[PDB]
């Protein structure tokens, strides 16, 4: 159980959600399991979507549990020139299947947040 905790879409104090996840998949599918929104204001049909690809519209910001993810690819190094070193793509990242005793906290899509004003 790679226990995950989402800091969702900045709201007043926090906007935390909780989710118990068995590691092994990517971040995209493991989020779309716990039904928490990742693709910002991006709809089903064709907008930025379809997983493991180009556009890069999922920019999850990792705060806690960073030392449990797969290492960064070079597509992440490419599509994230604007990044602070913190966040990654999460559509080409995986959590280890053997890390069933992890503890990871994630803030969802940035550029729609006003935070680090907290803690």
């Amino acid at each position: 159980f790679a226990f995950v905790s989402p800091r969702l879409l900045p709201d007043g104090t926090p906007d935390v959600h909780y989710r118990t996840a068995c590691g092994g998949q990517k971040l995209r599918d493991i989020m779309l399991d716990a039904y928490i929104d990742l693709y910002g204001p991006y709809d089903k049909l064709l907008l930025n979507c379809s997983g493991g690809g180009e556009c890069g519209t999922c920019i999850v910001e990792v705060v806690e549990g960073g030392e449990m993810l797969s290492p960064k690819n070079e597509v992440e190094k490419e599509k994230l020139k604007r990044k602070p070193k913190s966040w990654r793509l999460a559509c080409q990242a995986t959590v280890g299947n053997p890390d069933s005793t992890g503890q990871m906290v994630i803030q969802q899509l940035p550029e729609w947040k006003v935070h680090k004003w907290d803690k």
Binding site: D11, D37, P41, L45, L109, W112, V114
Partner: protein, 34 residues
Amino acid sequence: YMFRIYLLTFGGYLRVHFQNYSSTKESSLYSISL
């Protein structure tokens, strides 16, 4: 697709501001007091 464009950019909530992703309208409104 010609109607995809129209439905995308003329019907909705002005996704810049619709208070699910961005909060830039009213937050500093002093909720329950001391």
